[PDB]
């Protein structure tokens, strides 16, 4: 009924009403970095 990944998290599931398999891919994420000249020069920043 359920599949699992190395972390024991759910990898895929079988839909309980219609028996098809759905992959579960966690929603996009990532670190956010701010690129900035010192604030003694400018308050403009770029975001990575």
């Amino acid at each position: 009924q359920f599949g699992r990944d190395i972390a024991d998290t759910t990898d895929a599931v079988r839909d309980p009403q219609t028996l098809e398999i759905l992959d579960i891919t966690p929603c996009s994420f990532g670190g956010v970095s701010v690129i900035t000249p010192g604030t003694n020069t400018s308050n403009q920043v770029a975001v990575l």
Partner: peptide, 23 residues
């Protein structure tokens, strides 16, 4: 360096790169 490659590496360097290999 070998000018014919997509990355100008030498013959020997290519050999080295071909030997060393969530949510």
């Amino acid at each position: 360096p070998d000018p014919s490659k997509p990355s100008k590496r030498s013959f020997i360097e290519d050999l080295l790169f071909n030997k060393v290999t969530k949510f």
